[PDB]
């Protein structure tokens, strides 16, 4: 069931959110927000800069002080606030999904049925952890009582990408708040709108002021201010590996703040000859084409065993030729635009390298339409490992299909990348499923599926695809700081 | 009981250790190793550089390959090798403690009774974790079987300080090996000798070649090579906050390798009027003067409530006037030298600032002897928060004593530092013990004691005193990399 | 704020609840339910027997079958159903608290502000665990992949006491359902009504049929049927140690079903001379008099150091003389009736032993009123360890106060009982707080408080006060069954 | 490599072991110990009774008192003692394996290579847990500091079976001692000798007196004394389900002591048509015939899909016809005797039911030899579910092979038993491996293997095959007792 909003969307929240109030930029400057399907301006939003980040950090620091409402409230009450926030997002599901679709160029069916469902489910999952974050009592040598506190770290700077604005906002704030941190959030310059609406709901849910602060603005200004700030305890960032490197450097040069990064991928799939072929084709297809290819985990290198390679390519091409391009709000449309010009240019440049370096173009290969940042869904076969399209994250609707004969060799090829976010293995062989998944240098490995992500599972990269994990039990670790307390006693007993 | 070595120590192991063999430097260069008590040369050791680090990383990468002996052996067998290594260190306890004392300027009683005991106990603790590192099975949404593997990360670069060469070597290699990593270790240029002897014992214990590689050499050459290497997965470093910042930057600029840091401190103690005064004096004393003040956790700011301040200072000064300076090998000697000239100069410069900025010198305040890097044990009272001796890590035998009247204010003062490694609270009040320890921004808080460190407890800094934790259950986390494996199934059941 | 119900309570749900429908007893028999404040009949309820338990177990077995809705639904959806049930209980808070007060003789303020709040909070806590119950992946010796599943056990028989009917219903069903079990619940014969209303809400919330089945009836018939049933996997029981012994025997003689028991106490407090005296008096007072003394954790032996004993007794007696006895529904009334005649008789018999064995009666000592099972709040001083009132659980408003001079001796006296549910320690001494609490043989030890119970903490007895723990992370263990799965693989890697 | 003892075994330790000394029985009575291969008397051992169990419990209670050496020593030192004990068992490996083989009728190769290796490995595993048993710090509602202690339970009665005397002794004492309990051990009347030798090694290793006490004697006397004792906190028992029921009853009737049970099985294997047939035959074969069938996990019902059934039976019969019966000490002998006359009679009676109820005898079916309790290895095909040999644990070298066509039906048949210890699934289908193993009601499920048991994995039964788990992380839970300590504080902070 796909219900829709019955009135035109009106944009209300366009200002900086600090201490549960709306602020103009210190500059007085604003910046435009565009719709990528029409190239039209949707509205202007206050442009946050270093001066505004400083106000937000001061607010978050004050909300984190010992004795404050956020520090002293029961853990179970932090959980309650998060479950309330999920209920409010559920209440505003139609408007949020519309806004997400309109600002982000995201298919409305996916926005409503997947992104919003995921936001709500993830918030509810995180809410359940709040009063279940525990330290330890430890049988130390000598006559001492030793325990640990898993405290919140403090003020967390969180830089959110444009590809999944609402989902990634919640993946960041859910665990951070559950653990008792305060946050300064910088949504993507392309997509600040849904975050600002969520801020209105944070205020409505009853979070104490300064617990969540949202500063829309640009990467090289507001993002750099966050990453270099002397009083931000931790920075979380999702986006390009290139910017990830700058964040990690700036944290080092400033105040040695903790850093977690979810970055690019060039994720491989390995399709063995014994695989359920149709299942592999469909998952690998969705794996690379989901959200116009604008996913870190895009299955952007598909290695298929020689004997089923031709059949795999044929079936893949026929699936890729079935899309309907257009405005992501219109029912039945199955491919929206890319987010902006830079991304659009990068994709087209990479598609040209595939042609020029001698990959076989099966379909697509150019732009589409008179308006919007649309790229035809593109398939390349006979791709080799040295090609630009085999090495660089495209972040567009561009599928690479390669052949292999040797399993030893294809695992090396799969692993022969600085990336390491995810991988897929398609086989009916139990031993191969376990041994291949163990040998792949990737944070998540799917077996006979692809792109299955849930709140209960930790998610993150090996190698240059990231540092740390988000979600699951393990993800909550990087939002706590462990303190050991050791007390002298006259005599200990087991 | 303090037994001693019956024959003069002969130095045997002076070369680079790669793939369980001894190598000359690619350069052919060597560097001198000095005794800090005599200023005499002990021997020459092969100088490792980028070229030699590259050989060690290649060896560690090869030992980490899927299907290798170190990857395929039972976890319990990794544990067995570590327990064997502890037995061998126990066997060579007299020679190791002598070597440590002679190279490191460390009191032999402490070297033998504390450092060596700690090495052996920590190795045994780590050995027990090897087959107890477990992932999870997770009740993910949808029809899937999801589990996690807590894999080793891979090749870990480990840069060891000069203050506790053997203890810190084991704090690094114990957990890394227990978890199944391979290591490239760079001992301090001042103190490579005990590490090279341990390398001989790693070979004897039966570790596969390339699992542990030890490259003596300099920070700006070998250390920088490690931190900037494109095929090192993780770097662990203990030392100055200043160098810590360079490590974190270089990791960012190179390959986004994981980084854990244990850095400086300016650790405070808070002594309430109701404290057991003698107990507080003794622990705070040892807290700052241990190993000639060359401890990250030095209790280098002691805040004492006004009404007991004078009595605290008097009792502290009388304890500090009881040392016997000399060669750390001679029985009854209770203070050895500082490690080298740079450290010696820094300490003397800081002692001069205390005098010039108007702190009250109670005892000490200058050098001692005609040879060696000896500093008189020094006490300053009436220290204020703006003084250099109150802000900068001295890393020398220099005690600062300050007064307070307000508990609110003194916690702010205690926390008013970029450091955050440890703290001490001395009180008989249950509520104060719990509330003060919660409010202090420090990784370890001791109550009615100080400097109590054990293998069972996680250890590390808040703020610029470090990133991550070592030892305990929690410390083992930063030597694993979590992989999620998600398998499509027809139907799941709880 | 104490809001109240605006219309007279009408009783609606009086039948057996199996497969989400209302059933008459197979017998056609019914039994009366009384109000203990008036001795008046409130209604008749269907009397369940072995024949009816058999129907409920068949329903629970069927709902637990592989492939069923309850087995196949997402863990997060079990959580959702539990959070929905808490919302519904919150919606019906006024009627449930009134019903609880009227049927259970429980003060309405406590029923509304404590019991109902606790039900809702505990359900919400349990809901959060549902998708966080995880097994392990284990580095077994040899070439195998080994993981564990923490499965639900299956059909759980749950026998609920009359003292906290709603709270204990939720303490039982919350964790059992969160873990994925199905349940057959036998509320106390005295207090079936609130459970049957909750059953109506389980149906409304959308739980699949047969997941929760509620069979009102008698202990020796329905309770014995549960404990002896050949197809019930686990029995949970809270009540007398005497009946606890019969349950454990019957489980042994039948099908070796798992057993957890929360039984009686004779919980001691130790009040040191340095204690905050007023704080100790108030907590020890509420500790023994809460809900007319009808709490397993009643602080029924208070040991006070000689020098403050007289002052403690005086202050205790003055607090005990301030109650207003009456109908628990009338505002300002501060003591309701005992639950029934058997309990009333037992209490009066025990009070008579105190007088006859030579305890000093400070106040109370007899019945009150012309209707209802009221006992005057009673205090005895100079109680000695051999007295019946010092050995037997009274389960009434009867406080015992004893003196001690030796701490060694008083810990022995405190521990010298077959019971072991809880204990209290009142002192300002950190060392004493830690060492005494370690030495006491009791499941929960309170320091400078008493009777503090929360969903986040495991709760249960040492010795004959119980087997197992409820609530907290640890309590969820006894509602799972661990299955190890070990898979042969060609080669394992760490 | 199978080394052997170079001198005849002399029996030395034949007395009751209490407080690290050797005691005669209070009665002065002794009982004979026989060799099952020759039926000859090996020696006489002191017969312990209730009077002797009382002495052992008093010793264990005293060793468990607060302030005792076992309670106050560092957890790491409990670990050290256990690793020392493993080294001593390793030192005495030849004599222990010989003694085990001679007393227990166990093949010497297995005794030496499996049983002794398993004892040593399990002890070492347990030693590693000692200082890694941790409680929690918990974010309770309200202004409180709450932590838990995972204390030892206290005096644990441990009743050891005759089939794996040394392995099961260590499976019991390893975890119990690691957790800090004291034990009263009752080895099997048939096989007390290896336990008494281990007791000599417990004394030599330096365990404090009263920590381990060993009382040889009979089940209905010494075993019943243990199970009914008013001051034993916990009883662990491995043996028949029948006696398991008596233990659980007696615990209920006496002092509600905690009970863990590992009991019989009638463990099924399911062999799908797509299985590696030879691998399935070999594992199922060893699965049922290991140690003369005297294993709780015996694969005593093998269900094979119709199309491969005949081939499975043929290959099974040819493997079963290859044994060499004789004295378990002679090299090349591959089947020893059954333990005693009762077991021998039960096996022969059951083999007769198979013949008489119409199972097809493929080989064996009678006794062997002029001395010893030898049974010919026996195979029955065309077994049906109602046959005695399909329902009753034989505990002898008797293999049952059944056919199936329907997977739904065979899972029901597999589960249609009151037992539930283990199961095996043989298939090449990933989905079937996961779904079948989830659906089987068994504590351990092997996939493409059988009988793989390791220290790292929890082990125990569903249903009437047991209560609780041994070994792994999870097994350590049933040797601790959780105490919650909740401390009033002025203000809590996260
Ligand atoms: C990691 C991101 C980039 C994943 C974006 N994405 C999604 C939709 N997601 C967003 C919402 N998210 C949740 O928060 C959640 C919590 C509980 C259940 O879901 C689930 C994943 N579906 C996908 C993909 C995808 O990136 N690829 C490649 C695919 O193939 N499919 C099918
Ligand atoms: C953190 C380092 C710099 C601590 C160096 N240090 C030591 C001796 N240590 C080295 C060996 N170490 C262990 O590995 C261990 C494992 C199990 C038991 O001990 C224990 C701590 N004792 C100290 C101090 C110290 O730095 N300060 C300030 C003190 O006051 N005391 C008493
Ligand atoms: Cl911890
Ligand atoms: Cl995990
Ligand atoms: Cl487990
Ligand atoms: Cl716990
Ligand atoms: Yb254009
Ligand atoms: Yb000099
Ligand atoms: Yb009456
Ligand atoms: Yb015979």
- Candidate of A96, A97, A111, A114 to mutate for ligand 1, largest count of ligand atoms within 8 Å of Cβ: A114
No. of H helices and E strands in chain B? 17, 22
For residue C382, what are its two tokens? 């100079």
Domain hosting B335: range is: 265-454
Are B182 and B63 contacting, i.e. CB atoms less than 8 angstroms apart? yes
Is B131 within 8 Å of D131 when comparing Cβ atoms?
no
CATH at residue A90: 3.40.605.10
Q: What is the DSSP string of A166-186?
A: HHHHHHHHHHHHHTT-EEEEE
∠ CA B46-B51-B55, rounded to 5°: 90
Cα–Cα distance between A174 and A157 in angstroms, integer? 14
Contacts of A92 (CB under 8 A, 6+ apart): A197, A201
Q: Which of C187, C156, C171, C239 is nearest to C480 (CA)?
A: C156
Q: Where are the beta strands (DSSP E) in B258-314?
A: 258-262, 268-271, 301-305
Number of domains in chain A: 2
Chain breaks in chain A (C to N over 2.5 A) after: none
CATH at residue C377: 3.40.309.10
Please report which ligand is nearest the Cα atom of C136: 5
∠ CA D440-D442-D444, rounded to 5°: 110
Please report which ligand is nearest the Cα atom of B483: 4
Q: Which of C65, C79, C80 is nearest to C175 (CA)?
A: C79
Q: Which of B386, B169, B383, B161 is nearest to B288 (CA)?
A: B383
User: Three-state DSSP class for A460?
Assistant: coil
In chain C, whose CA is at the least distance from the CA of B136? C136
Q: How far is B346 from chain A (nearest CA, A)?
A: 23
- Count other C-beta atoms under 10 Å from residue C242's C-beta: 11
Q: Are strands B480-488 and A135-138 parallel, antiparallel or unpaired?
A: unpaired
Q: Does the annotation flag C395 for ligand binding?
A: yes
Q: Where are the beta strands (DSSP E) in B171-285?
A: 182-186, 212-214, 234-238, 258-262, 268-271
Q: Is C3 exposed, middle or buried (0-12, 13-18, 19+ CB in 10 A)?
A: exposed
C98 and C176, same domain (yes or no) = yes
Q: How far is B14 from chain D (nearest CA, A)?
A: 34
Resolution for this experimental structure (Å):
1.8
Is C494 within 8 Å of B67 when comparing Cβ atoms?
no
Q: Are strands C480-488 and C144-152 parallel, antiparallel or unpaired?
A: antiparallel
For residue C163, what are its two tokens? 């003292």
- Of A47, A262, A305, A362, which one is the catalytic site residue? A262
Cα–Cα distance between A63 and A208 in angstroms, integer? 8
- Count other C-beta atoms under 10 Å from residue A276's C-beta: 15
Are C71 and C49 contacting, i.e. CB atoms less than 8 angstroms apart? no
**A468 at interface of D, judged by CB pairs closer than 8 A:** no
C340 and C448, same domain (yes or no) = yes
C269 and C258, same domain (yes or no) = no
C6 and C125, same domain (yes or no) = yes
Length of chain A: 494
- Count other C-beta atoms under 10 Å from residue D361's C-beta: 15
Largest Cα separation within chain D, whole Å, is 81
Cα–Cα distance between D291 and D284 in angstroms, integer? 14
Q: Is D6 exposed, middle or buried (0-12, 13-18, 19+ CB in 10 A)?
A: exposed
| C-alpha Rg value of chain A to the nearest Å | 23
Cα–Cα distance between A359 and A457 in angstroms, integer? 36
- Count other C-beta atoms under 10 Å from residue C244's C-beta: 24
| Residue among B128, B132, B493 minimizing CB distance to D79 | B128
Angle between helices A116-129 and C75-91 (to 10 degrees): 70
Q: Which residue has the tokens 């990528």?
A: A36
Please report which ligand is nearest the Cα atom of A372: 7
For residue A134, what are its two tokens? 């525990």
C472 and C440, same domain (yes or no) = no
Length of chain C: 494
C481 and C358, same domain (yes or no) = no
Cα–Cα distance between D237 and D253 in angstroms, integer? 17
Q: Is C342 exposed, middle or buried (0-12, 13-18, 19+ CB in 10 A)?
A: exposed
Q: Which of C477, C471, C440 is nearest to C457 (CA)?
A: C471
For residue C425, what are its two tokens? 């320690």
Cα–Cα distance between D364 and D351 in angstroms, integer? 9
Q: What is the DSSP string of D70-96?
A: HHHS-HHHHHHHHHHHHHHHHHTHHHH
Pocket flag, ligand 1, residue A457 (CB < 6 Å): no
Span between the terminal Cα atoms of chain B, in Å? 59
Pocket flag, ligand 2, residue B164 (CB < 6 Å): yes
Is B493 within 8 Å of D438 when comparing Cβ atoms?
yes
Is residue A262 part of the annotated active site? The answer reads yes
| Residue among C251, C462, C486 minimizing CB distance to D481 | C462
* DSSP bridge partners of B21: B18
Are D264 and D421 contacting, i.e. CB atoms less than 8 angstroms apart? yes
Angle between helices B306-320 and B277-289 (to 10 degrees): 50
| C-alpha Rg value of chain C to the nearest Å | 23
Q: Does the annotation flag C262 for ligand binding?
A: yes
Q: Does the annotation flag A240 for ligand binding?
A: yes
Are D146 and D488 contacting, i.e. CB atoms less than 8 angstroms apart? no
| Residue among A83, A134, A492 minimizing CB distance to C473 | A134
C358 and C376, same domain (yes or no) = yes
- Candidate of B106, B161, B296, B453 to mutate for ligand 2, largest count of ligand atoms within 8 Å of Cβ: B453
Cα–Cα distance between A414 and A409 in angstroms, integer? 9
CA distances to C19, C153, C476 from C156, rounded to whole Å, are: 15, 8, 13
Length of chain D: 494
For residue B46, what are its two tokens? 């092969």
**Residue ranges in B130-192 assigned as alpha helix (H):** 165-178
Cα–Cα distance between A136 and A148 in angstroms, integer? 5
Residue C394 CA to ligand 9 center (angstroms) comes to 20
| Residue among D249, D457, D487 minimizing CB distance to C138 | D457
A350 and A408, same domain (yes or no) = yes
- Count other C-beta atoms under 10 Å from residue D235's C-beta: 26
Residue A60 is inside which H or E element, if any?
helix A50-63
D254 and D208, same domain (yes or no) = yes
Size of interface A-B (CB pairs under 8 A): 198
For residue A74, what are its two tokens? 């029961």
- Of C47, C126, C296, C470, which one is the catalytic site residue? C296
Q: Which of A192, A182, A218 is nearest to A52 (CA)?
A: A218
Question: Which residue, among B457, B480, B492, would best test binding to A if mutated, counting the most A CBs under 10 Å from its CB?
Answer: B457
Q: Which of residues 12-31 of D touch C (CB under 8 A)?
A: none
Residue B401 is inside which H or E element, if any?
strand B398-404
User: Three-state DSSP class for B302?
Assistant: strand
B186 and B255, same domain (yes or no) = yes
Is residue A296 part of the annotated active site? The answer reads yes
Kindly state the DSSP code that residue A465 receives in the 8-state scheme. G
For residue A336, what are its two tokens? 């929206």
In chain D, whose CA is at the least distance from the CA of A69? D493
Q: Whose CA is nearest to atom 12 of ligand 1?
A: A118
Q: Which residue has the tokens 């900086």?
A: A16
Three-state helix/strand/coil letters over chain C = CCCCCCCCCCCCCCCEEECCEEECCCCCCEEEEECCCCCCEEEEEECECHHHHHHHHHHHHHHCCCCCHHHHCCHHHHHHHHHHHHHHHHHCHHHHHHHHHHHHCCCHHHHHHHHHHHHHHHHHHHHHHHHHCCEEEECCCCCEEEEEEEEECCEEEEECCCCCHHHHHHHHHHHHHHCCCEEEEECCCCCCHHHHHHHHHHHHHCCCCCCEEECCECHHHHHHHHHHCCCCCEEEEECCHHHHHHHHHHHHHCCCCEEEEECCCCCEEEECCCCCHHHHHHHHHHHHHHHHHCCCCCCCEEEEEHHHHHHHHHHHHHHHCCCCECCCCCCCCCECCCCCHHHHHHHHHHHHHHHHCCCEEEECCCEECCCCCEECCEEEECCCCCCHHHHCCCCCCEEEEEEECCHHHHHHHHHCCCCCCEEEEECCEHHHHHHHHHHCCCCEEEECCCCCCCCCCCECCCHHHEECCECHHHHHHHHEEEEEEEEECCCCCC
B91 HSE (CA, 13 A, CB side): 11
Q: Which of D135, D172, D133, D132 is nearest to D156 (CA)?
A: D172
Residue A441 is inside which H or E element, if any?
none
Q: Which of C61, C52, C58 is nearest to C23 (CA)?
A: C52
Residue A445 CA to ligand 4 center (angstroms) comes to 14
Is B434 within 8 Å of D127 when comparing Cβ atoms?
no
D259 and D269, same domain (yes or no) = no
Span between the terminal Cα atoms of chain A, in Å? 59
* DSSP bridge partners of B480: B152
Q: Which of D386, D359, D364, D236 is nearest to D292 (CA)?
A: D364
Q: Does the annotation flag A264 for ligand binding?
A: yes
Residue A370 CA to ligand 7 center (angstroms) comes to 6
Q: Which residues of D37-60 are buried (b: 16+ CB within 10 A; e: fewer)?
A: beeeebbebbbbbeebbbbbbbbb
- Candidate of A121, A164, A451 to mutate for ligand 1, largest count of ligand atoms within 8 Å of Cβ: A451
D328 and D398, same domain (yes or no) = yes
For C346, phi then psi, to 5°, come to: -55, -45
Contacts of A409 (CB under 8 A, 6+ apart): none
- The neighbours of chain A, by the rule of 3 or more Cβ pairs under 8 Å, are B, C, D
Residue B280 is inside which H or E element, if any?
helix B277-289
| Partners of residue B252 in chain A, C-beta under 8 Å | 245-252
């Amino acid at each position: 069931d796909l219900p829709v909003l019955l009135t035109d969307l009106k944009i209300q929240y366009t200002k900086i959110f600090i201490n549960n109030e709306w602020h103009d930029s210190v500059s007085g400057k604003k910046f435009p927000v565009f719709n990528p399907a029409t190239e039209e301006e949707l509205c202007q939003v206050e442009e946050g800069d270093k001066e505004d980040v400083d106000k937000a950090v001061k607010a978050a620091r004050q909300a984190f002080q010992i004795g404050s409402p956020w520090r002293t409230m029961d853990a179970s009450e932090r959980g309650r606030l998060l479950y309330k926030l999920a209920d409010l997002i559920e209440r505003d599901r139609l408007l949020l999904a519309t806004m997400e679709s309109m600002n982000g160029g995201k298919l409305y069916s996916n926005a409503y049925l997947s992104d919003l469902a995921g936001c709500i489910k993830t918030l509810r999952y995180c809410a359940g952890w709040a009063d279940k974050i525990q330290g330890r009592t430890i049988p130390i040598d000598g006559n001492f009582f030793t325990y640990t506190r898993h405290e919140p770290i403090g003020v967390c700077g969180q830089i959110i990408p444009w590809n999944f604005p609402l989902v990634m906002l919640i993946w960041k704030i859910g665990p951070a708040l559950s653990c008792g941190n305060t946050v300064v959030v910088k949504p993507a310059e392309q997509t600040p709108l849904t975050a600002l609406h969520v801020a209105s709901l944070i205020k409505e849910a009853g979070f104490p002021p300064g617990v969540v602060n949202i500063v829309p603005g640009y990467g090289p200004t507001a993002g750099a201010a966050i990453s270099s700030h002397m009083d931000i305890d931790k920075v979380a960032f999702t986006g390009s590996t290139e910017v990830g490197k700058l964040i990690k450097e700036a944290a080092g040069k400033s105040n040695l703040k903790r850093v977690t990064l979810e970055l690019g991928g060039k994720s491989p799939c390995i399709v063995l000859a014994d695989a359920d072929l149709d299942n592999a084709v469909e998952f690998a297809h969705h794996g690379v084409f989901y959200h116009q290819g604008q996913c870190c985990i895009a299955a952007s290198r598909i290695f298929v065993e020689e004997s089923i390679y031709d059949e795999f390519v044929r079936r893949s091409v026929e699936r890729a030729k079935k899309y309907i391009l257009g405005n992501p709000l219109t029912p039945g449309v199955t491919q929206g635009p890319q987010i902006d010009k830079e991304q659009y240019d990068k994709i087209l440049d990479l598609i040209e390298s595939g042609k020029k370096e001698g990959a076989k173009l099966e379909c697509g290969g150019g732009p589409w339409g008179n308006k919007g940042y649309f790229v035809q869904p593109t398939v390349f076969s006979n791709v080799t490992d040295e090609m630009r399209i085999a090495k660089e994250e495209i972040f567009g609707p561009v599928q690479q299909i390669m052949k292999f004969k040797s399993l030893d060799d294809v695992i090396k090829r799969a692993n022969n990348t600085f990336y390491g976010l995810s991988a897929g293995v398609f086989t009916k062989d139990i031993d191969k499923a376990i041994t291949i998944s163990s040998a792949l240098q990737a944070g998540t490995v799917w077996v006979n599926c692809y792109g299955v992500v849930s709140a209960q599972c930790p998610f993150g990269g090996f190698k240059m695809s990231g540092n740390g994990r988000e979600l699951g039990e393990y993800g909550f670790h990087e939002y706590t700081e462990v303190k050991t307390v050791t007390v002298k006693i006259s005599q200990k007993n087991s």
